[PDB]
Amino acid sequence: QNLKSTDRAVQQMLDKAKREGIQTVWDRYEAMKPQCGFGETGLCCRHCLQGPCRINPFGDEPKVGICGATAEVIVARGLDRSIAAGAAGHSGHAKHLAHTLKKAVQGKAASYMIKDRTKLHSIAKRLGIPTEGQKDEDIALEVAKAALADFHEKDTPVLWVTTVLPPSRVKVLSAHGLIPAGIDHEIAEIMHRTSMGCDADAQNLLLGGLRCSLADLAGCYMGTDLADILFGTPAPVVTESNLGVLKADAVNVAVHGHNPVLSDIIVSVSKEMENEARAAGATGINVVGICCTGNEVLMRHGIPACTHSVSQEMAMITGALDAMILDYQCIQPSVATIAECTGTTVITTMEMSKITGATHVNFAEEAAVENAKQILRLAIDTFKRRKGKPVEIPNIKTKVVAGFSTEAIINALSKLNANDPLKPLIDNVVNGNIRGVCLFAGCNNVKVPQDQNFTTIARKLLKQNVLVVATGCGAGALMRHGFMDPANVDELCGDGLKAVLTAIGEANGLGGPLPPVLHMGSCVDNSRAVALVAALANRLGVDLDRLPVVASAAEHMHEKAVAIGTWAVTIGLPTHIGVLPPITGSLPVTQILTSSVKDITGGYFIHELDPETAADKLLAAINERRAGLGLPW
Amino acid sequence: QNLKSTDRAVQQMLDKAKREGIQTVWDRYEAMKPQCGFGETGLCCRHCLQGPCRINPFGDEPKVGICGATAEVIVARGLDRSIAAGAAGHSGHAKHLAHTLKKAVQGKAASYMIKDRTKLHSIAKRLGIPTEGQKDEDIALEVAKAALADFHEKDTPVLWVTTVLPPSRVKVLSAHGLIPAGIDHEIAEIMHRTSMGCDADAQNLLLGGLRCSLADLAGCYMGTDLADILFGTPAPVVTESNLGVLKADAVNVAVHGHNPVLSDIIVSVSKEMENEARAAGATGINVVGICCTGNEVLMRHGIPACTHSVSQEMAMITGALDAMILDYQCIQPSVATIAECTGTTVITTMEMSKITGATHVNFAEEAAVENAKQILRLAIDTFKRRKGKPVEIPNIKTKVVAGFSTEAIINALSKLNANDPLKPLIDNVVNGNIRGVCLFAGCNNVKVPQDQNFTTIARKLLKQNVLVVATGCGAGALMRHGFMDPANVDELCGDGLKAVLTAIGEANGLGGPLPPVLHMGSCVDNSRAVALVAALANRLGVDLDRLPVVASAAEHMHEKAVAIGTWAVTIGLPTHIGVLPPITGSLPVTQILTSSVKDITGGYFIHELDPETAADKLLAAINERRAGLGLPW
Numbered sequence A, B: 001q002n003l004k005s006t007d008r009a010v011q012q013m014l015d016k017a018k019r020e021g022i023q024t025v026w027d028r029y030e031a032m033k034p035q036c037g038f039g040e041t042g043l044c045c046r047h048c049l050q051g052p053c054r055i056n057p058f059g060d061e062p063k064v065g066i067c068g069a070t071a072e073v074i075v076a077r078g079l080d081r082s083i084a085a086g087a088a089g090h091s092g093h094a095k096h097l098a099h100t101l102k103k104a105v106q107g108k109a110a111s112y113m114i115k116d117r118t119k120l121h122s123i124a125k126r127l128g129i130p131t132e133g134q135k136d137e138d139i140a141l142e143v144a145k146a147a148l149a150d151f152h153e154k155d156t157p158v159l160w161v162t163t164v165l166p167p168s169r170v171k172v173l174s175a176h177g178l179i180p181a182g183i184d185h186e187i188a189e190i191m192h193r194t195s196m197g198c199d200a201d202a203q204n205l206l207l208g209g210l211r212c213s214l215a216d217l218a219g220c221y222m223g224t225d226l227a228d229i230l231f232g233t234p235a236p237v238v239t240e241s242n243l244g245v246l247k248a249d250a251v252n253v254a255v256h257g258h259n260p261v262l263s264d265i266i267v268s269v270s271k272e273m274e275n276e277a278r279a280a281g282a283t284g285i286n287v288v289g290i291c292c293t294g295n296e297v298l299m300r301h302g303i304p305a306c307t308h309s310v311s312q313e314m315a316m317i318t319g320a321l322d323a324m325i326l327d328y329q330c331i332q333p334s335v336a337t338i339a340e341c342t343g344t345t346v347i348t349t350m351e352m353s354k355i356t357g358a359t360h361v362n363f364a365e366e367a368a369v370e371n372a373k374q375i376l377r378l379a380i381d382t383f384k385r386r387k388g389k390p391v392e393i394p395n396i397k398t399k400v401v402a403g404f405s406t407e408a409i410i411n412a413l414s415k416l417n418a419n420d421p422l423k424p425l426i427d428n429v430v431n432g433n434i435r436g437v438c439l440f441a442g443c444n445n446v447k448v449p450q451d452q453n454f455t456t457i458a459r460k461l462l463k464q465n466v467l468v469v470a471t472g473c474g475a476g477a478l479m480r481h482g483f484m485d486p487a488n489v490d491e492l493c494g495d496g497l498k499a500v501l502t503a504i505g506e507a508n509g510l511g512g513p514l515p516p517v518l519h520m521g522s523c524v525d526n527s528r529a530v531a532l533v534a535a536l537a538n539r540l541g542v543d544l545d546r547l548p549v550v551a552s553a554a555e556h557m558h559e560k561a562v563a564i565g566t567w568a569v570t571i572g573l574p575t576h577i578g579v580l581p582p583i584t585g586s587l588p589v590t591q592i593l594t595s596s597v598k599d600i601t602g603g604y605f606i607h608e609l610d611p612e613t614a615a616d617k618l619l620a621a622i623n624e625r626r627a628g629l630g631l632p633w
Ligand code: SF4
Pocket: A045, A046, A047, A048, A049, A050, A051, A052, A053, A065, A066, A067, A068, A069, A074, A195, A196, A197
């Protein structure tokens, strides 16, 4: 089972699933081999009913699509649509938060409020919204109106792009026409230009893709901004991760999906309901996280993370998961079928994300506390049905220090230099205690033994004194393998990096270092890494493509992740991906993404499937940036 | 060659292409067989990087996607994305017209103006925009602002849906939550909900698709409204069609694509430039149409239609096509390669629609007349290069009466009843001289011998006294085979229908009938058929799903056509499609689209590949509506 997942708790559940005849994601993957080579290389098109069209990667006919579309056009069009779909997911998440803030501040949803008024004011200041003499509710209404305005064309471009990157970067992008005009505007234009008989120039198509990826960045950044206003900016927290955070004697309730508008309410309400749960024979309600909505409530509330991404079915296989509360994105629909075997109550809550066979509760912000209680009462009922059943919770968990928002990282650094908090970080970059910065982002992927790329790459970078930050299921992989436990700094970290983590941690009243990896939050919270990197660039007086900063989507899967990696390249970062998207069928497209995009944005993709080799290439990328700044390496 | 196209001019060019070694769309289609069965049935998914996933239509594993996505989910998600892509094309077209009108009326583009002020005022009245005491330029600015506002969420739903259908229809759709909230909003929500790990309920997914198809209707209707304001509402015109409208001794310039903002300027400017052309040795500039932008300038100016859709390469094969001026949609990118052989100057003009190897001219409304002259001068230069080359223009053309906007049809009927113009039409429906109405819409498709379905179905319906209206390349097919020539009424039309066409034509000072088929315009002008049908429903006091009105997308291809057929079903019409979209791999999805959608909207799809059988099924659908109204049939 270690060929399927490197996580020991997942291996134990895989053994249980096998002997109980419950099919898993890995079984369905095995039933799919050999996968289609046309799809895997990107040489397939179904964008009109003369198709499906395919192109042999090598050999004889077919060489060209029926309408005349070349390999490079078909590949670029497919890639553009996956960026647009990713932008649509991140932007829908942000849009739903914008409506929630608007309703809260108009008195239409009393369960929601301005929890971080400091964040509210700095955002409004960044957007040019005046704050002096204004009520908080009026400022917030202006912020929510500005968020919603960025989805369509207006007299300004998308402000959640132009006000969050350095002016030099914005200018490089405006020069190439890459600034989005409206988030949903760019999504629709991608679908238009990629439909039959429209854009048929690989470079033109890919430039549209870079622009749409910046619409995705804007949705991520807007999502992080609005969630922090509504639910609070994360600060350092201590919790646990992996399946052992389930408790047989408690009502175990997983929050799963991406948007915390739902799950943050669940967290608060479940505390009100401890007495209901005890009445049923539980010790209490044990809310745990799966995927990014789990990351959200982990970052803000210390809710323990149960599992992530590809292994999400195994939380149910324990037999102890009484409810799984879903909003949208990255939910394997198999959970609705597996629930018939495991007893779990799977509950959908969003109108546009239902699963056949799951119970649906029509969540509304106006009725959030009522809905939470209805859902949690179903979880209580499910616990009573299993009172007296054996469960198999693997007794495996790690300690997780997390909550490292960019504001938290600044604050932590400020204990070393109050009025110039970025300087201690840059000092240790310059003197070599910090070789560079690597962000791990994105999903797990059944194609890759779970967590194997994240941990292998992280281990080599940390020994080489790279400061490693992480989001999404990359944070989940690293967290479940001990990389967020400061007790592992001695084992994992090079001497220079250990010295820096120790200095910062000691100055922050901790008695020990910061953890080996800094957890920056959910997938939209990749925007926090952008805020940190832009602040470093501004403090250094250079553009982002001169910083020793790289990204690694080491095991990615989702269209959202494809978009993130694309905007990481567009804002100037060398960006490793550990699973190839369907692009190898066009050498010209591959050359653009790995080489010539350098001349447009200064970033570039690093395609490398072997993780030890990927780590070497990321180190080389970091060290080239170091040399370009005149630094030793 | 008659297995490839029923059009004799196309057959002659196919013979020329074969002996000259120029590959055509039919050759590329032959090089594609056997096409992928997974793609053709819809049982393939590439929406995440764990894919490609496929499902055997029958037999053993794979039975389910890797994430657990069932056949019905995979099929419904693929269909939803094709509706959204179609909506994105029609809405981009309309959006570009909205900007053109705004710039014209703000004094930013002097080449554009309010040409139809009657249309401008009736639209503003329909939208609730006040007109009394307002300058036309201020009313138009309000209309353009309202168009652009329908692309995003606001305090009203999409007005180009709710103000163009009868209130009873709007209410049926609101009850099912099918009213779009914003055009680009719905497109982005489709891409979100269909991405990995989101909506996984076939009925929920398809209800989203019906809503997005109404966003496509709104873009069509808005596109027609704005083009009529800017360029004039069509009125009856006489012209010709097919390749014989090319002239060896003239500069032959094709306008090709969809958006007439470009080609309407070309038409006017080319007249200014007759003397330049004569100086080069041409008789003049001969502008001809291809595809829907050809339909636009045919409807408004009587520009002859050269060819359409699947046969567009054959206009170049004559050797006489000096320029092909492109905007976007339905352009085979092969034209840029074929131009190397034929001498044609292929010119792209839109920023998001370029073709490798074609010349690009950056069209801007602010500089439209200048751009037109630059393009036409390239066409003149190309004519000089072929002075003394042999051309092979097949001497084949038909006479085409067209220009039947809904306003023109009302006006024509008003000569029989001035103050109740719809009544003579309804009279002859009731007494049986008109059995019903059939709209032919959509593309040609290389899978179907060109025009064979359109003409076979039209012939049987016309003998059965159906009033036949047509748009897009369905109008092109019928027009190139004589169905728009009133001289063919005796041969084609049943006695009841002939009597009605003759009565209307005689009352309109024509000496003969209306043509056998009424040309309602381009693809977005399918909205005119909606206006006509809604007006009939309102005059009759019933909803559209009680009218003896059907639609036939007899040979369709493009994602735009998939969307149109879907909203034809959503507004209540039995809707035949003559090529199946990728849906046969899910019987539950097929059952929804062909049967149970009846209970939601009253419309339904008719899947029928055999055209004689399709005609019988359309007649049965028309006759069931007749019976439901208590009429003989
Ligand atoms: S758009 Fe072109 S390549 Fe794609 S399916 Fe249609 S004919 Fe084939």
